[PDB]
Amino acid sequence: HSPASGRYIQQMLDQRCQEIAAELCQSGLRKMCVPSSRIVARNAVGITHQNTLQWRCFDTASLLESNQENNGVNCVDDCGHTIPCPGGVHRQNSNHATRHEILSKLVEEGVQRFCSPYQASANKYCNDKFPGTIARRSKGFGNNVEVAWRCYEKASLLYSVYAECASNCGTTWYCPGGRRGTSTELDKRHYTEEEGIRQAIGSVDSPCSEVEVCLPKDENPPLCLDE
Numbered sequence: 001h002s003p004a005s006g007r008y009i010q011q012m013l014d015q016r017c018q019e020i021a022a023e024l025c026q027s028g029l030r031k032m033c034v035p036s037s038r039i040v041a042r043n044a045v046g047i048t049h050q051n052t053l054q055w056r057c058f059d060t061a062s063l064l065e066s067n068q069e070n071n072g073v074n075c076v077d078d079c080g081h082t083i084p085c086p087g088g089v090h091r092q093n094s095n096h097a098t099r100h101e102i103l104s105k106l107v108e109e110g111v112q113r114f115c116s117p118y119q120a121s122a123n124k125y126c127n128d129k130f131p132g133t134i135a136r137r138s139k140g141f142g143n144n145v146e147v148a149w150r151c152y153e154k155a156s157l158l159y160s161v162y163a164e165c166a167s168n169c170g171t172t173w174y175c176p177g178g179r180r181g182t183s184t185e186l187d188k189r190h191y192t193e194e195e196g197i198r199q200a201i202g203s204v205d206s207p208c209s210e211v212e213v214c215l216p217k218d219e220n221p222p223l224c225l226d227e
């Protein structure tokens with residue numbers, strides 16, 4: 001038991017994608033006849049002219065190892081935010097199936113199960129003030145030690161880096177989507193908001209009596225135990 005996100009929403013999406021690829025193969029779509037290990041859900045551009053971000057089922061053998069632009073893939077955290085993860089879309093050769101409605105719907109279901117009400121408030125404060133940002137306690141520009149609560153632009157985060165977030169008791173937790181504190185242009189795309197985020201976090205109602213002890217969990221609700 002790590003005090004860390006289980007990435008359950010992403011996990012559902014990949015599984016649902018594996019099912020869809022299997023169905024398509026049964027329908028004769030030869031390129032979709034692959035083992036499960038080869039299919040994931042990414043939120044990304046598609047082939048040329050498929051220029052918006054959509055949930056699609058990708059064959060990982062058709063993914064590039066890195067991106068240039070505007071072709072990076074995104075994964076999703078347990079609050080429903082899409083965050084860069086490794087890989088890139090080959091705009092001519094991608095093997096995928098766009099499944100935007102089914103996959104979006106599973107995200108919305110997964111948000112009710114898995115998203116910490118304390119993290120949701122931290123994210124709401126961030127999005128209200130700086131549209132498209134979410135809250136982490138992580139690194140800033142050109143400094144790989146110091147952490148602070150900030151509103152980060154999602155494109156500047158890395159899914160494969162875990163960074164501090166709020167658990168569903170408003171305590172220390174770690175979530176995919178963090179910073180390395182390197183010195184790139186993306187490493188500047190955040191707004192430090194220690195007081196605002198902390199007060200957003202502080203303003204959420206406890207899921208436990210003032211007399212119970214809240215033990216966080218990677219799914220809602222947390223454990224409440226008598227003091």
Ligand SMILES: CC(=O)N[C@H]1[C@H]([C@H](O)[C@H](O)CO)O[C@@](O[C@@H]2[C@@H](O)[C@H](O)O[C@H](CO)[C@@H]2O)(C(=O)O)C[C@@H]1O
Pocket residue numbers: 140141187188189190191192193
């Ligand atoms: C350029 C950008 O997107 N973000 C800046 C950010 C913003 O300017 C924002 O207004 C911060 O709320 O500013 C950052 O640095 C800040 C300093 O400019 C300020 O004097 O001290 C602040 C300490 O809380 C803060 O460090 C930021 O918020 O982190 C740098 C960031 O790249």
Ligand SMILES: [Cl-]
Pocket residue numbers: 005007077078079175176
């Ligand atoms: Cl998360």
